[PDB]
Design a protein around this motif. Structure first.
Motif, short mmCIF file in Angstrom:
data_model
loop_
_atom_site.label_atom_id
_atom_site.label_comp_id
_atom_site.label_asym_id
_atom_site.label_seq_id
_atom_site.Cartn_x
_atom_site.Cartn_y
_atom_site.Cartn_z
N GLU A 37 16.61 -0.04 0.83
CA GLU A 37 15.25 -0.16 0.32
C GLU A 37 15.20 -0.12 -1.20
O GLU A 37 14.43 -0.84 -1.81
N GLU A 81 2.94 8.86 -1.68
CA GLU A 81 3.33 7.94 -2.74
C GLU A 81 2.21 7.75 -3.76
O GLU A 81 2.47 7.75 -4.96
N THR A 132 0.80 -1.21 0.00
CA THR A 132 0.00 0.00 0.00
C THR A 132 0.84 1.27 0.00
O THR A 132 1.61 1.51 0.93
N1 LIG Z 1 4.30 2.41 1.15
C1 LIG Z 1 5.07 1.97 2.22
N2 LIG Z 1 4.64 0.93 2.95
C2 LIG Z 1 5.38 0.50 3.99
N3 LIG Z 1 6.54 1.04 4.36
C3 LIG Z 1 6.99 2.07 3.65
C4 LIG Z 1 6.29 2.57 2.58
N4 LIG Z 1 7.01 3.67 2.02
C5 LIG Z 1 8.18 3.83 2.80
O1 LIG Z 1 9.03 4.72 2.57
N5 LIG Z 1 8.20 2.83 3.83
C6 LIG Z 1 9.21 2.59 4.91
O2 LIG Z 1 8.82 3.19 6.16
C7 LIG Z 1 9.87 4.08 6.58
C8 LIG Z 1 9.35 5.22 7.47
O3 LIG Z 1 7.92 5.32 7.40
C9 LIG Z 1 10.56 4.53 5.31
O4 LIG Z 1 11.86 5.06 5.59
C10 LIG Z 1 10.60 3.17 4.61
O5 LIG Z 1 11.62 2.33 5.16
#
Ligand SMILES: Nc1ncnc2c1[nH]c(=O)n2[C@@H]1O[C@H](CO)[C@@H](O)[C@H]1O
Lengths: 207, 207
Positions: A91, A28, A23
């Motif tokens: 990532e 995003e 999700t």
């Molecule tokens: N759509 C998404 N779903 C789950 N984790 C995410 C995500 N986008 C995203 O950047 N993350 C992770 O969550 C971290 C902090 O929210 C980020 O630095 C990523 O490691």
């Protein structure tokens, strides 16, 4: 929309799926349609909020694999700290299994990072001080960058990296795609948008 | 992305391709993923054409067919002018062929519009003075509104419709989804968003 609902390569969907990533966060969700088509964006969100896939996926989708040893990177992400460079590089490596990602940062010797760049890189995730070091050396080549990302720009600003960030951007082709992430959109971020971006769409999810 | 790249009903895609429309504008592309999932958003784009599908397609997708005689509208779109009420009603009609769209506006008598509303409606596209008049008469019932749209809020402000727009928004269920479009985001629009919207994402494509 889930990530599956976006036009992404099967391999990328597979990688996402295997990582429990399904999700997009609101930033995003709104960013992907524009970013996947190569458009410049400014993403404004609360620090710590997940937005990595707003640039990671566009890089993954846009860049095809390459084996050309010594090849220069086609994506550059600038981030304020070693910790973020390692986290982002990680990532990105996961969502772009076909791409060689190299993290670059200060607080250590030159050799290792330097030899990774010499071997070849598809994407470099770097702190600005160390990246500029490698540029003036001739080790980091930015003449083939297609996508440049400025992560946590407010912190890069507070840390005093303004001049380094600009020099590095100026070293890349102006035809590149540029994505800028700033929580508060201070004067410097606005100057970046004006000088280094092309009709950037602003997406603000602060609420 | 093309419209076909979004999760839209095949018959809605058919309607679009029938009108010769295959590609969203940048505001539509960025807005669709969030709007289709029922989220609130502020779309900052130029006045005139180029944004209708950012709200018309979510209305088309969200609202199932209904045959109930005298049914009350489940979507309300406000426009600043009579000309735009007609235009937007026509545009929405074409992309939501399964819905009954009724245009409401001054500059003509009350008879035909009242008749149409009493027969039933799925979406109403209205100028604020006439909409409020019908509300006061008990002809327009807003208690079933699931989606409210303000199309070109800046001009509503400049024409002096603030009080009417707020009264109309207040008459709808707060559980609704709200989409607000405006070119400049003046104080009034910000206070509207604070009072009548739920954590809206802002998308600004102004070049
Ligand atoms: N759509 C998404 N779903 C789950 N984790 C995410 C995500 N986008 C995203 O950047 N993350 C992770 O969550 C971290 C902090 O929210 C980020 O630095 C990523 O490691």
């Amino acid at each position: 929309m889930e990530f599956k609902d976006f036009p992404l390569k099967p391999e990328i969907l597979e990688a996402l799926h295997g990582r429990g990533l399904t999700t997009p966060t609101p930033i995003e969700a709104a960013a992907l349609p524009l970013a996947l088509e190569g458009k410049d964006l400014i993403g404004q969100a609360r620090t710590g909020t997940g937005k990595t896939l707003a640039f990671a996926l566009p890089i993954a989708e846009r860049l095809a694999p390459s084996q050309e040893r010594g090849r220069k990177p086609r994506a550059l992400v600038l981030t304020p700290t070693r910790e973020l460079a390692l986290q982002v590089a990680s990532e990105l490596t996961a969502v772009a299994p076909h791409l060689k990602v190299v993290a670059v940062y200060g607080g250590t010797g030159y050799g290792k990072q330097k030899e990774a760049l010499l071997r070849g890189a598809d994407a470099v995730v770097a702190t600005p001080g160390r990246a500029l070091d490698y540029l003036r050396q001739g080790v980091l080549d930015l003449s083939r960058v297609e996508v440049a990302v400025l992560d946590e720009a407010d912190e890069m600003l507070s840390m005093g990296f303004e001049e380094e960030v600009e020099a590095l951007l100026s070293a890349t082709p102006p035809s590149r795609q540029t994505l800028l992430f700033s929580a508060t959109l201070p004067s410097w971020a606005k100057r970046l948008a004006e000088r280094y971006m092309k009709n950037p769409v602003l997406i603000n999810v602060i609420k």
